[PDB]
Amino acid sequence: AAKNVVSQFVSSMSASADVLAMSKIEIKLSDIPEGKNMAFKWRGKPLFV
Amino acid sequence: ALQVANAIIGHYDCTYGGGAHLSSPLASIAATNKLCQSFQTFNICYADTGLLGAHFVCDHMSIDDMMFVLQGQWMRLCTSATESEVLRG
Amino acid sequence: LMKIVNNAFIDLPAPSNISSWWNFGSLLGICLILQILTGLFLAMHYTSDTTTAFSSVTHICRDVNYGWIIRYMHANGASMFFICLYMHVGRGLYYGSYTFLETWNIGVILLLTVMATAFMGYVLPWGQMSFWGATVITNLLSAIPYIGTNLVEWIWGGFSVDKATLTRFFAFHFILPFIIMAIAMVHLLFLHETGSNNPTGISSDVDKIPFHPYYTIKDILGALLLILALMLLVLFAPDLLGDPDNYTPANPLNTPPHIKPEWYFLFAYAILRSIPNKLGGVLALAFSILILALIPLLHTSKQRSMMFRPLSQCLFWALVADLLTLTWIGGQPVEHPYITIGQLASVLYFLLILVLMPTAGTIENKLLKW
Amino acid sequence: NNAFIDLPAPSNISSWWNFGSLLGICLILQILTGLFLAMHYTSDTTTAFSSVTHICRDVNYGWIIRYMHANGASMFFICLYMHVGRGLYYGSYTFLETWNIGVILLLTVMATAFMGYVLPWGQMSFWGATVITNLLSAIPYIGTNLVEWIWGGFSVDKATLTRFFAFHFILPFIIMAIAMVHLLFLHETGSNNPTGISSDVDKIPFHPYYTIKDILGALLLILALMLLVLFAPDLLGDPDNYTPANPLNTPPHIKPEWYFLFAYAILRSIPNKLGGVLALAFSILILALIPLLHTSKQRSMMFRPLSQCLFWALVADLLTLTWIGGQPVEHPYITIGQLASVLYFLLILVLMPTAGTIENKLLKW
Amino acid sequence: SDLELHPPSYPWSHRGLLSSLDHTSIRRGFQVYKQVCSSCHSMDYVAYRHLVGVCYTEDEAKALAEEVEVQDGPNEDGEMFMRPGKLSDYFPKPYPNPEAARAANNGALPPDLSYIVRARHGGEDYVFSLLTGYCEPPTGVSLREGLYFNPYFPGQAIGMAPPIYNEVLEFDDGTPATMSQVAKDVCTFLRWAAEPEHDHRKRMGLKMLLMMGLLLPLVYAMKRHKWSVLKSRKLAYRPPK
Amino acid sequence: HLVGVCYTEDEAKALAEEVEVQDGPNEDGEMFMRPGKLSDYFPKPYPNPEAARAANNGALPPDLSYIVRARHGGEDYVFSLLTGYCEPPTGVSLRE
Amino acid sequence: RQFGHLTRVRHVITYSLSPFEQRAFPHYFSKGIPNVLRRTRACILRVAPPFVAFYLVYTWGTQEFEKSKRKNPA
Amino acid sequence: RQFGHLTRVRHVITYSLSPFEQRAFPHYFSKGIPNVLRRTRACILRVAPPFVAFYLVYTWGTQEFEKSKRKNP
Amino acid sequence: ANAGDFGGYYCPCHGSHYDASGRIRKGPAPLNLEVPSYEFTSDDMVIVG
Ligand code: HEC
Ligand code: HEM
Ligand code: HEM
């Protein structure tokens, strides 16, 4: 009983279901001039192209 | 072996010259902390049974401490008797 | 580290005969810890802005892992808290435990603080009951002459219940339980000066047993039964003791036609509703709780407990039946014949405590020739 | 009473002994201003920063309560560092229980202030939450899991801000309970004094002597706090936190709150992840080792010249590390910081214990 | 009028204490919400991803989400745009705000349905009765245009026209779409919408009952063991005399 | 906020009315424009930063409510920046 | 309050058995039921009446309420 | 720890005056300054050097830093 | 981007220098910046994830 209870509480702190709903991102390359580092917000973090 | 064990814990009374320095932890604690007037271990034998234990005399406020230390000593002998205290016994 | 954990628990002397009615003190301690634990975890996902409060609660119940069980455990735990509180107070009245004046009066403060705490928590999800409960209860203060209205607006942070209200209520609801915990520790310290009373009302100094292992195991058994009752509610009927109207977001333009208080406030609401006067109802409400502080001064019997007092027992159960009547009436519309039944029940409540019981006490004394 | 009024106290404790009560006052001040700010603060990332500006612009006197809370946190650390310094210098650490609880208190206050700084969700709030929680990622095998669990996701976000408000809200009350335990252990022995010699032959009652002296100290604390709040509320703060959090960009001259600069300098001096984290942890936890490193036959440093010189070298070194923490990771700061970091541990682990032994020799015992 | 007609108790297959929801029925119920109710009622707290592993596979749910266009943006030009829906999107709202909804419904407001079953006394018994209970006004009752007589609605005058009837939609599994069948399935779906934790709490409840059936008598045995020392103790009074 | 600081209540009222702000929904569920009033915040020049960057060759004009507290040097910095534009030194060539 | 300082007791002997030497449920049903029945009987006349009264007031009031909500031919 | 049970003291006499019979600032400046000067001098050699070192390291490092950022250091 | 001693990237938090490949070259970082899964599609587009 303690194991189940404790793990359910601990689990409530892990990423909630909405946070896990991830997908892919499409990026238009013709907008990134040569020499440029473009930053996008993706899956929570910065994505450099 | 029970007699040896009982000799390790021993006996004691307020007139013993030993005091704090007595070898038996029970006698030593009892003397320094004034836990009892006296105590004695015993091994009363009968044909196929007997009474192995101790008797003590103390102030009304020292019974619990006496019992605590006495039982702690039996327990220590069960799990941790040392060669040197056993040779002494 | 040892002592005061111990001589304050392990070798604590306790009566050999306290019954199950003495289990509610530890059950209240457990309800408090439960509320605090589930409360903190809910607070890790709850947001107090009116635009997002209701939403954050549905997010807890729908998307946070096990968020639903923590939420319904908190909601139903508040109900268990009151069931235990009322059993605890009843035990005290029946057995004359109130003669421990300090312990008793601190207890009265504890009851009031838990009521205020539960009130504020109910406001947090910002559903319809949340909003109108915040409106009505804070307005009780408007009965205070000269400054009443000013006090209300100050509490609200404006001219009506709004964002400022919800945000401060989250803060008040957050800290109050910890204050309750400190008050309860004082509750216990005063009790330890005397030790517990027992079913007979007779000193038990000639027959004490150590709290451990006798009451430690008995309290654990009680704790298991409390958890069973709680989980029967959480897992099989989580909304049974709740109100459907709070599943509707707050609407400041419309008060639901059959609005009614949380079940544990129904008896007091019935009493207030029975008096067709603003100040009069507020005073009757306040007095319905504060009268508990008067019980000790109303004790007339030569005996502490009601165990050996037949007449007092009959009146005691009439009081309980009466509170049950007021609870039922509080759930009914303000129509005939409920308006009259409630007024009689309200009058009967104060009559039993202020007049009938003290009188039964004296009569019993006479019958025993002292 | 007897926990205050007739509490026996040394007749000679100095102003260095005023910081304990001042810490109590800093704690009460933070709790009072904190609760009032919590009455108007909202923890959703969409509205946190906004609610703080709302407090400062529209809540009656919201600005003074806010800046008193921000600057109060700085006063808290000034007092904490003075309090610890007094303890090291006078050998107060020999009161082991009191001292170790004190170490727990320091760590809890640090953790508490860290989380509060995240609440306004400005740039420093966001990157501080990122960096500090990531310290846990140095833990082998499960480190990364612990971080995501703390964050409630794969990066600092809403879930993080909301739980941090809750943690920051309750921790100070826990600190208060721990501080009461701190005092209870102290009361078993009573206070140490500048001489390090038992003062049982000359005790005076806490009231009225130290009650009035503590009040005078409290007045000076309030003056320092209000000089900051009314004349320079941003002096000890960072301009970058007036910029809302931007997860796509870490400010180029990002630096920690001033009271964390020395530790940050130490971590930055080691070009290894686990090594830097271990040095950081150790720079604080080493306080727990001080008692075991005491070699002197005397408790206080009052009568120990060599020990005093090394003590001030340690303070000057922490001042050096504080300065370095505020400078870019460039030459010659990289090397000065490495030397200062090494000197810190060397003074505590080797030079001071050695000075203690030499002094004993010179006194012939 | 102020007279009230309370709903009877239908024997829902999820009514029992250990009875789970019928997931095929949840699935058909979603088709009803989608095909019929969604044009006027929002369901703001349910997303396509919530359907996965409940009544649709991940791919089916994705396909369902892509059947709609949702607003997103800003793009790099600072403008909003439309895109096919995805699992993380919440069910599309039929109106931008309550004012618009009222405008589109003769002034009445179709409430959000995410919690309708928990937000109404009688729950699905009430909703099923309302949907299948429209009838002619009794003699002497005349409703303003825009209102329909429904004995189960408070006051009996509702702003919603009968929304379902035989063949109002076709089910993916060929189930005959009679009005009562459609009502029964949408209600089952609405129960799940209001209480997605429904099946899990009951499974847990079963485990809780079994564990208590074990722990309660065992702890009780432990209680009696310890207490036996006292329960069988014997006293004797031997005063000097 | 300008009232009693640098403008009277009526002057500020007139200032607010010089602009149109969005409000709504009305009873038809639609948004509409109206003259500004004292409770309105200063109008934003762009609906979002993307539109701002787009309108400014990719650079983002920061919000100015806290710019002085958000920059080392405060107004000394801002004054120096505004009055300090000059030709690039020899050897420096900036992108358009 | 501590054992050793509660009160004065003289001439009382107490005999007890180790829990390992005895049954935890001696005559549980054979003697427990009779005792439950006895306890129940001893209190019923003090506990039940008020609740019966409640039941009567409850049923009477509820019925009177429904009756008042109908068929009033005028 | 309570007065009455702290420690053993014999043959010590203590004479005191009521605060109402005496000055609160006797020779405040006339004797206070000399004492401050004495205390300041007695510690300076132990306190100041490390801070002087800090100052030197501080000025040296800062200058070295600037010099390194230009064409001709 | 474009800072540090390798014309790659410079992390201002504790001085980690990366090259234009995202590889860690100097400082306390233990690993090269993560390379996510991606595929170059039609047009001049890249889908990451
Ligand atoms: C628009 C053309 C509608 C369709 C299609 C359906 N509903 Fe509806 N419903 C509509 C309105 C405007 C209202 C408001 C009625 C009022 O007078 O307030 C409603 C209301 C409901 C309710 C709430 C009833 C209550 O007790 O308040 C329910 C339970 C309801 N509607 C359910 C529902 C379902 C499940 C539908 C698809 C089968 C459905 N409605 C269609 C407008 C419209
Ligand atoms: C948060 C609320 C409360 C907690 C946590 C609490 C806890 C306790 C505990 C642990 C005990 C000892 C065990 C027991 O006898 O039950 C006790 C005893 C007692 N409590 Fe409370 N209590 C609470 C509320 C109250 C209230 C509301 C009252 C009465 C107005 C009250 C009155 C008493 C009294 C008089 C006793 C003595 C009981 C006796 O020995 O007969 N308590 N309580
Ligand atoms: C005496 C203890 C407590 C009581 C009686 C209590 C009571 C309540 C009640 C009745 C509600 C409304 C439940 C509902 O949604 O229907 C509530 C909500 C809430 N409580 Fe508590 N509470 C207690 C302690 C705490 C503590 C200590 C915290 C947080 C540190 C807390 C946090 C919350 C939160 C976040 C909510 C909103 C979410 C929700 O509605 O479930 N509570 N509380």
Ligand code: HEM
């Ligand atoms: C929330 C933080 C803290 C509070 C409220 C606090 C409070 C106190 C108080 C009230 C005193 C007595 C007055 C004094 O001598 O200063 C004291 C003494 C002391 N504290 Fe703390 N403390 C805190 C943190 C710490 C820390 C971080 C340390 C050291 C790591 C510590 C170590 C000690 C020691 C050793 C003493 C005995 C001092 C002596 O008698 O010389 N304290 N503390």
Ligand code: HEM
């Ligand atoms: C050990 C005591 C405490 C410390 C050291 C502390 C420290 C801090 C720090 C450093 C900040 C950042 C301030 C800023 O720059 O804006 C903060 C923010 C805040 N603190 Fe605390 N705090 C303490 C206690 C509390 C308590 C008890 C509460 C509330 C119950 C609280 C409520 C807040 C709130 C709501 C904010 C956000 C608004 C703001 O940034 O001013 N704090 N705290």
Ligand SMILES: CCCCCCO[C@@H]1O[C@H](CO)[C@@H](O)[C@H](O)[C@H]1O
């Ligand atoms: C333990 C069983 C107590 C009786 C449960 C009834 O509970 C009541 O149900 C009503 C709906 O019928 C709710 O509106 C009300 O708030 C609730 O307290």
